Amino acid sequence: NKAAVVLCMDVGFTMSNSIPGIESPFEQAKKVITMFVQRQVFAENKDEIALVLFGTDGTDNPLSGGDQYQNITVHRHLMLPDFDLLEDIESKIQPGSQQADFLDALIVSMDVIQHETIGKKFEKRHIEIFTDLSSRFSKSQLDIIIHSLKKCDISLQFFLPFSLGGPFRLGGHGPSFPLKGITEQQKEGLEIVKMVMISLEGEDGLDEIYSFSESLRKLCVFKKIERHSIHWPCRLTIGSNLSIRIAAYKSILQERVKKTWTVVDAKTLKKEDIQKETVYCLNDDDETEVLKEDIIQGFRYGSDIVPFSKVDEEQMKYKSEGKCFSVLGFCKSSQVQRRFFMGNQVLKVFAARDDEAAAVALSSLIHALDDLDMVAIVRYAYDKRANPQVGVAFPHIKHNYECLVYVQLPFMEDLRQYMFSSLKNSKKYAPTEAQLNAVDALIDSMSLAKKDEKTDTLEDLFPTTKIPNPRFQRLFQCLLHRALHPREPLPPIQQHIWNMLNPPAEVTTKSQIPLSKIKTLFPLIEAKKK
Amino acid sequence: GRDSLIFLVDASKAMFESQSEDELTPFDMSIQCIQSVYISKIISSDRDLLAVVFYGTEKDKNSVNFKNIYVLQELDNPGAKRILELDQFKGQQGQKRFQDMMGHGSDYSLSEVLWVCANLFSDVQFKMSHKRIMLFTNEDNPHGNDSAKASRARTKAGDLRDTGIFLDLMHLKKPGGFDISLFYRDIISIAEDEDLRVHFEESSKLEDLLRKVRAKETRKRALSRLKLKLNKDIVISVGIYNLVQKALKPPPIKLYRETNEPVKTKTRTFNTSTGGLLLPSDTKRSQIYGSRQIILEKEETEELKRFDDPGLMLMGFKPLVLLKKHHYLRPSLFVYPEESLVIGSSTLFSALLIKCLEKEVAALCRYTPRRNIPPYFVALVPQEEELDDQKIQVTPPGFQLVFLPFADDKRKMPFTEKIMATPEQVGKMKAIVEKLRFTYRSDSFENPVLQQHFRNLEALALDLMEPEQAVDLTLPKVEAMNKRLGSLVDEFKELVYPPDY
Ligand SMILES: O=P(O)(O)O[C@H]1[C@H](OP(=O)(O)O)[C@@H](OP(=O)(O)O)[C@H](OP(=O)(O)O)[C@@H](OP(=O)(O)O)[C@H]1OP(=O)(O)O
């Protein structure tokens, strides 16, 4: 339902040391928090946030008493985020000239979480750390720390200047900070972090250590706070006798901006003043208004117009049989072309939660579908009032789980049959052999994958599905800038956005020459008239 | 855009003779096909006009008064009365009705038939966008006894093609086999773009000829014509088309209570905000967050969604293996070269397509439909052309535009440990599924809502006794597969399900 998060910035002097060609890590982490809190504020979620700093010249921890946890300031307690937080983080925060043990910061954070979650649901608790591990520390309490974390069930993530493992364009994909440039204090810090986190989250733990530049192009910050979807209970039936209790979830759904714009007066900035009226009239000459009681709902049937009352519509409208997920048959996976996918979502189908019998049956079905390389054609009806759909269900096996995937398929009415002239049989368009060689050379240069370790695996050099919507970030930044600088114009797009929206410089550099060759070998000119 | 079609149909003794009892009358093929195309047009709610003319008739009817020519309909939008008129002729009973009222079998010159058709087009008033005439026949040498008639038909066809008409010949299965080479090779509207040695085969099945005619008749409706930018320098022009589109139920319109006149709002009256009216410049856009209000100009609103000029810019190439199918986001689009803007584009397009197919890799581009729209990452999947056994354009050559979800669109799966199944259960399911294997043609399932609603509208418009309750194909034939399954289901259940459930 409701989560609670606290952010642990390093504001240390070492944290702010900009090697030329790279921004100061303090600035990068500032950008990361800016993004995160922007999302939180403009998502208007109910999850309160807290901010604690270490490396400050002063200290404000509740445990600062006793001459410990010094240089640690609790800048903001667990409250709902606000524009004031944004203003403080962009302006009020300045790089402190102090270095402190981040473990002490963890102690302060766990204290804060324990002492501020009182009387609040807080279905989730999680902590982020933005440090460089450049400062030494004491390995004393870390055992107590991890024990308390396990007892209190507190998630954890680590963010560093460099990833675990040309110009270091922030937010780029390929390159990163020189792995050999680390000071070997960061080596020890990394070892401690790795062992702590592996103790916490197991072998998957080392998957939660992100570099700031890498962080900006991922949603890993929200990975531990996002409200999981809600299942859709239903049964699928093969024939009459056979049925299985299952649940389904929306795995892909086009995210959309929540709050639309509101038109208001230029003078009083009020939507209340403005409103719209309308009149109804016959389309014939001598336009005479038509009052609503002289208006009846009608329908067009080609050249024909038929009156049709809404009551008659309801009485004659098609009526389904209610929620259902029945199957129809099976066909070659080859038959179902990937391009015929229709609809605007996908459904991953799981065995109904906590049912060994359903799990066994569904797993057997999935394995049979896979081995036969078949797919299932189903009749899907979300609700009795919804239009029933027909779509393909195909097995999707995985090491840790297995599930069916459903995608709506189209009816004949949605198809369009256009005739296209072929290209291979076009004597005016057949490319020359040299042209083909040039194209092949380009496509070799402009590759995006790479066979790695000769393990025949293919490491992507550009995961687009890991990139989030740049529109949300741009919108949030513009809104925040206006909210803080009302008279100022809109700031341009941040450079790192263009970085994440572009392939690594290596492919472009290698493609420079073949592109020129193609430009020479393919005469292209515009059409002027017409 | 507003075009028209003429379904010219021959009425001869061959047209009423069935090759086999299982086979249906070619005339029946034609009339049912015409009913199909009208109902499809009504569903699509297009503006194209249509008309039907018969020749070889014992009794003629036409303005210009040529014998054996029956202008049964004038160019017009489809109407329910027209549909009933057509349905009056389907089936053997309808064939007998056609014999009695129309009468079939008579000499004729194709030249005068085309002359009548040209006159009928001349009768139009609106801007007729295209000019298509589709012929239905199983006779390959109409003027095997009248050489002068054949020559006159040849010259008339040449003129009409020069005039701007398109004539398309839907030949039918006949004893001996139709061959366009004998007479129509110079008659048909052969596309000058390429050598149409490839051509549709003899039509025998109603579904097959229906696919043929529907594919032939329509015109490509370019959704958009963008520029594919390889870099700042290399650029080509392509036409984004959509092959699938959810046919929503047509919206209702308001009507006068008594006269049933199509009424019009013709009014968007403002308030006293500015007094009666209001200037758009006085309308700033704002949004509220917490106790804070943020206000922007409309131009400012358009500005923050600006990333780059509309079009496709290429970032790189990726093997199809790395790309997934379960990562569906929205209906895919289709891409075809467009040399009406940049010359030589199709050459590069074709070379690139061939090389991508050879390498089994797809292009990855940054889509941008129109001005000031945030981009999506899309994969250009090469799509090799495929032809049916009947020479049907099953799969158009070109690049299939596929949207790729953003990390925001991606959701996580809450789950505990999974459980496998015993191999015997898997084999039982394999047998069960094999008992239900069936080939799937994409043109198999109709939307029940659309059909039922249109049946209701038909019954109201035709003032029938009751609306026909259209059967649903989507609803499973539960008893049918129960029969097809036998006792396998019970054995599987006892293998898996516990005695209590
Ligand atoms: O990085 P990839 O090899 O392309 O694998 C991704 C990635 O998984 P991993 O990085 O852990 O292998 C996704 O995880 P997220 O980055 O979205 O957190 C995962 O999603 P889940 O862990 O939720 O299953 C997704 O799987 P899918 O798209 O099936 O949901 C999966 O791709 P694969 O399906 O190829 O493993």
Side-chain angles (χ1 to χ4, degrees), chain A residues 1-13 15-21 23-60 62-72 74-87 89-91 93-120 122 124-130 132 134-138 140-193 195-200 202-233 235-239 241-268 270-271 273-276 278-283 286-434 436-439 441-530, chain B residues 1-16 18 20 24-47 49-57 60-70 72-73 75-80 83 85-86 88-91 93-94 96-100 102-106 108-130 132-144 147-155 157-161 163-172 174-184 186-189 191 194-196 198-201 203-206 209-256 259-265 269-270 272 275-359 361-387 391-411 413-415 418-440 442-464 466-490 492-501:
Chain A
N1 188 5
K2 160 188 284 191
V5 186
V6 55
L7 310 193
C8 182
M9 184 64 73
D10 184 10
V11 73
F13 160 63
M15 187 66 204
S16 190
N17 284 314
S18 186
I19 297 89
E23 292 81 315
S24 68
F26 165 68
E27 276 193 355
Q28 323 169 23
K30 180 183 286 188
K31 285 172 199 36
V32 173
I33 284 184
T34 318
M35 183 278 288
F36 170 79
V37 190
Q38 272 179 56
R39 163 62 88 77
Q40 275 309 305
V41 170
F42 294 145
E44 57 195 359
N45 294 354
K46 305 292 100 177
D47 295 327
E48 291 173 69
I49 192 66
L51 179 47
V52 55
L53 317 179
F54 63 96
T56 57
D57 295 342
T59 182
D60 196 6
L63 312 185
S64 301
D67 295 331
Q68 306 321 120
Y69 319 98
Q70 305 298 324
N71 300 327
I72 298 172
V74 178
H75 178 70
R76 172 101 164 204
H77 308 249
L78 260 175
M79 283 73 74
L80 291 159
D82 62 348
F83 301 97
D84 312 334
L85 269 174
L86 277 297
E87 169 172 2
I89 193 66
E90 54 84 15
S91 51
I93 311 302
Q94 305 303 320
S97 52
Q98 293 282 50
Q99 312 289 157
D101 297 349
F102 62 99
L103 293 181
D104 299 331
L106 293 174
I107 303 154
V108 177
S109 56
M110 61 79 71
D111 186 303
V112 167
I113 296 299
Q114 275 171 268
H115 303 70
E116 294 221 5
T117 50
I118 319 297
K120 297 178 183 179
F122 281 158
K124 190 68 55 55
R125 63 194 69 256
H126 169 54
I127 299 197
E128 270 81 349
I129 297 160
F130 299 144
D132 56 356
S134 69
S135 171
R136 66 180 295 277
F137 58 95
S138 70
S140 83
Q141 209 73 359
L142 59 86
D143 45 354
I144 312 305
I145 303 310
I146 62 171
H147 167 48
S148 200
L149 282 194
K150 297 190 178 301
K151 172 192 69 178
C152 300
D153 291 331
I154 308 171
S155 305
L156 193 57
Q157 292 186 2
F158 276 79
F159 299 70
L160 308 181
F162 45 86
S163 172
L164 186 53
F168 303 142
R169 288 182 327 171
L170 185 62
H173 309 74
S176 172
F177 185 85
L179 272 186
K180 302 179 179 181
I182 64 172
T183 187
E184 179 270 352
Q185 304 311 112
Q186 304 154 357
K187 292 182 184 293
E188 182 160 297
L190 190 145
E191 307 328 299
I192 301 316
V193 170
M195 61 79 71
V196 171
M197 163 46 48
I198 202 76
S199 300
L200 296 176
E203 325 291 346
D204 298 338
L206 275 296
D207 205 10
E208 296 198 359
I209 318 296
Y210 315 88
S211 184
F212 305 144
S213 172
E214 187 176 5
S215 69
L216 290 176
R217 60 204 179 80
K218 288 192 196 317
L219 295 182
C220 58
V221 289
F222 317 111
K223 200 214 308 172
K224 295 297 206 58
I225 68 165
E226 47 164 24
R227 280 291 92 202
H228 70 88
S229 159
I230 177 62
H231 72 311
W232 174 76
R235 319 145 74 77
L236 76 165
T237 66
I238 296 91
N241 304 321
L242 179 53
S243 79
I244 297 171
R245 302 184 58 251
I246 69 191
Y249 306 77
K250 269 165 207 165
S251 289
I252 299 299
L253 171 54
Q254 184 184 8
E255 193 69 25
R256 300 213 159 70
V257 288
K258 326 193 283 313
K259 286 183 57 61
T260 186
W261 284 96
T262 76
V263 171
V264 304
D265 177 11
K267 184 60 56 60
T268 182
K270 292 314 170 69
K271 175 258 184 154
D273 182 30
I274 179 173
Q275 74 86 27
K276 296 298 301 167
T278 188
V279 177
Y280 298 139
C281 64
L282 73 165
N283 203 2
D286 297 330
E287 165 185 333
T288 313
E289 66 86 20
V290 175
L291 59 84
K292 277 73 69 177
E293 297 73 359
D294 295 326
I295 277 173
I296 176 166
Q297 178 196 15
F299 274 108
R300 188 173 270 279
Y301 190 82
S303 60
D304 293 331
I305 317 295
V306 60
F308 196 58
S309 72
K310 191 179 306 312
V311 167
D312 289 325
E313 173 199 4
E314 183 62 33
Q315 172 63 11
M316 294 298 102
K317 61 169 292 212
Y318 167 89
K319 287 172 314 299
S320 62
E321 284 71 3
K323 205 192 59 180
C324 70
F325 199 72
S326 299
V327 308
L328 296 183
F330 310 92
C331 63
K332 298 296 290 183
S333 53
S334 302
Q335 296 199 347
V336 61
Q337 266 165 102
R338 187 259 187 276
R339 70 222 175 75
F340 286 146
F341 285 164
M342 187 66 204
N344 202 347
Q345 73 195 340
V346 300
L347 277 297
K348 279 189 181 183
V349 173
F350 286 53
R353 179 146 275 279
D354 188 75
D355 180 354
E356 65 285 26
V360 160
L362 188 54
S363 170
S364 169
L365 183 63
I366 281 170
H367 285 77
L369 266 293
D370 182 76
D371 302 0
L372 280 196
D373 196 78
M374 281 315 78
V375 301
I377 300 312
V378 307
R379 177 178 198 280
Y380 163 72
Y382 173 78
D383 191 347
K384 62 183 61 55
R385 307 182 300 100
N387 294 333
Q389 311 173 8
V390 55
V392 54
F394 53 90
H396 170 229
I397 193 66
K398 205 163 304 303
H399 72 285
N400 73 294
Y401 75 94
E402 43 198 0
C403 64
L404 280 182
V405 183
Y406 160 75
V407 163
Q408 181 172 3
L409 279 183
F411 304 108
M412 283 74 74
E413 296 75 342
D414 296 336
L415 284 199
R416 293 181 205 293
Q417 306 324 118
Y418 301 139
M419 186 66 204
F420 294 75
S421 162
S422 159
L423 310 188
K424 274 147 54 174
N425 298 319
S426 59
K427 316 309 154 194
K428 66 203 308 298
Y429 297 142
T432 76
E433 169 58 34
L436 298 155
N437 307 142
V439 173
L442 177 65
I443 202 164
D444 295 329
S445 168
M446 192 95 58
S447 180
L448 292 191
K450 168 180 291 183
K451 276 188 176 185
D452 46 0
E453 287 172 52
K454 305 294 100 177
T455 54
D456 297 332
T457 52
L458 294 151
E459 159 199 9
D460 192 330
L461 299 192
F462 199 69
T464 122
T465 67
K466 294 258 190 315
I467 301 299
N469 218 323
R471 92 187 284 163
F472 295 147
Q473 286 314 316
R474 173 58 141 161
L475 180 145
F476 298 157
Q477 173 204 13
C478 294
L479 275 167
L480 171 57
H481 186 294
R482 181 44 61 89
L484 299 197
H485 317 324
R487 283 82 58 85
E488 289 69 356
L490 298 177
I493 305 178
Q494 304 181 0
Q495 173 52 35
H496 67 82
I497 293 290
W498 283 126
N499 292 0
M500 62 165 48
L501 287 177
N502 276 345
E506 289 73 0
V507 295
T508 55
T509 306
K510 296 185 297 179
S511 66
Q512 297 306 144
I513 308 165
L515 286 184
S516 176
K517 292 191 288 184
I518 293 169
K519 177 72 160 58
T520 62
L521 295 176
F522 281 89
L524 309 167
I525 52 175
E526 282 281 345
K528 325 302 167 178
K529 294 182 176 177
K530 201 176 185 177
Chain B
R2 175 207 280 291
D3 61 357
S4 306
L5 287 93
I6 302 297
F7 306 116
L8 183 63
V9 186
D10 173 76
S12 296
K13 278 71 65 179
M15 295 296 172
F16 302 106
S18 174
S20 71
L24 192 44
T25 297
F27 173 81
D28 202 349
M29 294 298 102
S30 298
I31 176 65
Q32 298 212 6
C33 181
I34 303 314
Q35 193 159 119
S36 305
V37 65
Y38 285 172
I39 184 170
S40 176
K41 278 321 196 58
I42 291 175
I43 295 288
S44 57
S45 66
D46 307 342
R47 211 167 62 244
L49 304 188
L50 288 144
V52 172
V53 165
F54 305 79
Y55 62 103
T57 79
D60 60 352
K61 185 264 199 169
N62 55 1
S63 65
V64 65
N65 300 318
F66 286 100
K67 190 58 188 68
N68 312 319
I69 284 174
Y70 195 84
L72 191 144
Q73 288 200 160
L75 270 180
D76 192 353
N77 305 269
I83 319 300
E85 182 65 26
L86 300 187
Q88 213 166 84
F89 286 137
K90 68 174 68 177
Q93 187 77 4
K96 289 179 284 293
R97 296 188 188 91
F98 198 97
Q99 298 296 338
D100 308 335
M102 271 325 288
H104 85 286
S106 57
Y108 54 94
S109 81
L110 277 297
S111 65
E112 72 207 354
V113 192
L114 272 299
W115 180 219
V116 177
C117 295
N119 301 2
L120 196 143
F121 288 98
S122 314
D123 303 336
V124 66
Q125 295 73 14
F126 316 138
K127 173 54 189 68
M128 61 80 71
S129 305
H130 298 262
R132 192 153 304 277
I133 287 174
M134 294 178 71
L135 182 62
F136 294 107
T137 178
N138 62 356
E139 170 58 38
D140 42 2
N141 188 0
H143 295 322
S147 82
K149 277 195 176 173
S151 52
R152 258 176 285 99
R154 282 181 168 83
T155 187
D159 172 27
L160 269 296
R161 287 181 299 100
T163 307
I165 196 68
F166 304 104
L167 73 164
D168 309 330
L169 187 152
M170 295 298 102
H171 60 304
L172 276 297
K174 88 164 184 65
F178 207 105
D179 47 349
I180 76 170
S181 69
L182 296 177
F183 170 59
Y184 313 99
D186 54 321
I187 302 298
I188 64 169
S189 173
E194 51 85 20
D195 163 74
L196 269 162
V198 290
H199 180 72
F200 288 3
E201 301 170 356
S203 295
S204 305
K205 308 297 109 182
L206 182 53
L209 61 89
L210 187 44
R211 287 207 305 290
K212 301 187 178 90
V213 57
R214 198 187 321 102
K216 170 59 70 67
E217 53 89 14
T218 176
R219 288 307 95 176
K220 305 185 291 187
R221 294 292 255 170
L223 192 140
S224 307
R225 290 198 288 273
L226 316 189
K227 311 208 300 180
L228 169 49
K229 292 164 286 218
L230 264 291
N231 63 351
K232 275 70 54 186
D233 311 337
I234 296 98
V235 64
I236 59 175
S237 158
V238 297
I240 311 305
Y241 309 161
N242 50 346
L243 302 191
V244 304
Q245 189 173 5
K246 187 170 175 63
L248 274 298
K249 158 163 38 174
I253 66 166
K254 311 169 183 61
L255 288 177
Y256 190 90
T259 79
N260 314 332
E261 178 180 0
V263 302
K264 167 181 59 181
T265 177
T269 305
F270 264 114
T272 186
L277 74 164
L278 162 65
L279 294 194
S281 56
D282 295 331
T283 69
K284 307 195 160 213
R285 276 70 172 175
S286 166
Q287 287 192 27
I288 315 303
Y289 291 95
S291 163
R292 192 81 57 104
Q293 161 152 19
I294 301 167
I295 170 166
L296 277 297
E297 298 330 293
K298 180 209 152 284
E299 51 195 1
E300 298 180 287
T301 310
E302 286 291 327
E303 272 297 327
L304 57 90
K305 310 193 276 166
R306 178 176 185 78
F307 276 95
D308 48 321
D309 296 333
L312 278 297
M313 64 184 73
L314 168 56
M315 283 73 74
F317 294 86
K318 175 178 292 187
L320 295 158
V321 16
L322 234 35
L323 298 148
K324 279 128 153 248
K325 114 246 230 336
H326 57 82
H327 278 166
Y328 166 84
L329 188 43
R330 62 202 309 288
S332 302
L333 306 185
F334 182 62
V335 181
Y336 198 81
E338 177 77 20
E339 285 183 350
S340 51
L341 306 195
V342 288
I343 315 304
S345 180
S346 285
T347 300
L348 178 60
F349 194 93
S350 177
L352 190 151
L353 163 62
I354 293 170
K355 294 322 282 186
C356 294
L357 281 178
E358 190 71 12
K359 298 283 208 306
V361 299
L364 179 60
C365 295
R366 217 152 67 211
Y367 181 65
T368 307
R370 74 189 71 251
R371 181 175 299 162
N372 302 333
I373 291 289
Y376 291 167
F377 280 122
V378 287
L380 293 186
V381 166
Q383 181 171 357
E384 161 60 23
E385 178 174 24
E386 176 189 312
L387 280 169
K391 300 293 193 295
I392 298 169
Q393 183 68 219
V394 178
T395 295
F399 278 97
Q400 162 186 349
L401 182 63
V402 173
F403 283 83
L404 290 188
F406 273 137
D408 288 305
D409 315 324
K410 245 214 233 211
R411 312 298 216 255
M413 303 319 293
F415 185 38
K418 85 179 189 74
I419 299 156
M420 283 73 74
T422 72
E424 57 167 2
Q425 289 151 344
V426 187
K428 190 57 141 74
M429 211 55 38
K430 293 168 67 61
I432 284 182
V433 164
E434 195 67 27
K435 294 302 291 307
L436 292 177
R437 178 204 298 278
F438 86 107
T439 181
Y440 160 67
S442 77
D443 43 29
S444 197
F445 301 89
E446 56 84 19
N447 183 321
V449 175
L450 272 298
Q451 292 308 312
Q452 187 40 248
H453 159 281
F454 272 74
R455 286 306 160 280
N456 295 332
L457 290 203
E458 278 169 72
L460 271 297
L462 294 174
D463 209 354
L464 266 185
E466 97 290 7
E468 187 279 334
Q469 295 302 109
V471 71
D472 174 27
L473 262 66
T474 316
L475 191 65
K477 298 182 290 294
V478 60
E479 176 59 29
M481 71 214 88
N482 286 335
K483 196 53 67 186
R484 268 191 271 184
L485 276 175
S487 169
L488 277 299
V489 64
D490 185 22
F492 156 65
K493 296 162 56 88
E494 67 185 351
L495 290 175
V496 161
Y497 271 127
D500 49 352
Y501 203 85

